[PDB]
Write a protein that binds this ligand. Sequence first.
Ligand code: CA
Ligand code: CA
Ligand code: CA
Ligand code: CA
Ligand code: CA
Ligand code: CA
Ligand code: CA
Ligand code: CA
Ligand code: CA
Lengths: 147, 98, 147, 49
Amino acid sequence: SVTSDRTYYGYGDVSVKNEPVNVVVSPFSFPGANASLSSGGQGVFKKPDWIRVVNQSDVENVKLEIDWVNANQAANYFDYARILVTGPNGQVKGYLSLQHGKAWITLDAEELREGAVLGAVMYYEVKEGVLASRLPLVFKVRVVETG
Amino acid sequence: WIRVVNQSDVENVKLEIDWVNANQAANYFDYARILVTGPNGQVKGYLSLQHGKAWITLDAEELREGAVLGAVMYYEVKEGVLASRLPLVFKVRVVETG
Amino acid sequence: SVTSDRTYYGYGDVSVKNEPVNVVVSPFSFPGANASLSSGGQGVFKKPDWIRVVNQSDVENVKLEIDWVNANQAANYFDYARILVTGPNGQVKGYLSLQHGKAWITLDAEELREGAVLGAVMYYEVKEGVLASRLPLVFKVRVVETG
Amino acid sequence: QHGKAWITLDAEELREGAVLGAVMYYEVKEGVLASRLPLVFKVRVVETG
Ligand SMILES: [Ca+2]
Ligand SMILES: [Ca+2]
Ligand SMILES: [Ca+2]
Ligand SMILES: [Ca+2]
Ligand SMILES: [Ca+2]
Ligand SMILES: [Ca+2]
Ligand SMILES: [Ca+2]
Ligand SMILES: [Ca+2]
Ligand SMILES: [Ca+2]
């Protein structure tokens, strides 16, 4: 007697909670301790553990764009400064300077699955006679493409 | 995921599976491909954000063993989107039975 | 009674996880230890194990483009500097200098399948009277074509 | 580019159990890194007898 409207349903939900990556920063105070940086000096500064990239259990491929924003200010203080981002396990995937300001370090399934540390190695020459204190160095980490 | 239980007489079933909120999930996903893992290994249905209709049909051998329809979903989340408990709703129409 | 829509399906997935190559760097500190580099001096410096190229189990053909970016800076310090990339197993596939800046070292199925080490041999003459410390030397490794 | 196949089986090939394997020749575009990419092929039975 009834003419059934023949429609039954099924459903499900998808939970996207976190962002793919956590860029834990441990900043560097490069004149260091028990050391000394003088005006006009030239040298190298090394920090083994600077940016730790922590991924979630699914993320396997990450493309990071590292960018130096205040480089035009440090141009008035340094004469050459070369930052090498000591990548995952000995590889060096990034190089920033006062002129070439963008890096594109990319990590894949082997480098993430062991804990990705990005140290810094800085080659510096202080412009002649410049005396400063607690100069800032700020790098923008953009996650451009993850998978 | 979808268990189709028939009565003792029904032998031929034509189901129209339809994804209604796909135009909403288009704002969240970049590609999403649902494969309706059919009765006993066959895959009779494929839905995506563009092609929205499936026509999975079961016959006398597949019903007489208990028809399970699993789902296999291939997904890529749009860049940077963070959500919680998003709904996915599929309309099951029985178009023709025999 | 039913008019079957005659379409069945088959499927599969392809997993591209890693990048073809890992350029493990072990940098060189060429004045070395128990040695000495003087101003105006002339000589040779050798490092047997400098860039180790580690491939995955499938990659067999690799074309690397080695490029010296800060050569125009070292031109103000050196008068001639010639880097020979001591290739896989005695072959020397690369030669960089202050003028000719690009190398195209390419490894094939025999050289990869034994562990590809790329040492450096540097022939140098320091410009007259120049005194420096911890000068940087940075080479860009581009993987142009793998197979 | 050429996306359609028309494989047809006759009385000898069916009567022994028809398996259809796949052999794939591939070159991955330069630098692309993916995971669990889908490959979906539509099987239409156009004419049976
Ligand atoms: Ca977070
Ligand atoms: Ca993505
Ligand atoms: Ca009946
Ligand atoms: Ca009917
Ligand atoms: Ca890698
Ligand atoms: Ca060879
Ligand atoms: Ca290739
Ligand atoms: Ca027929
Ligand atoms: Ca017949």
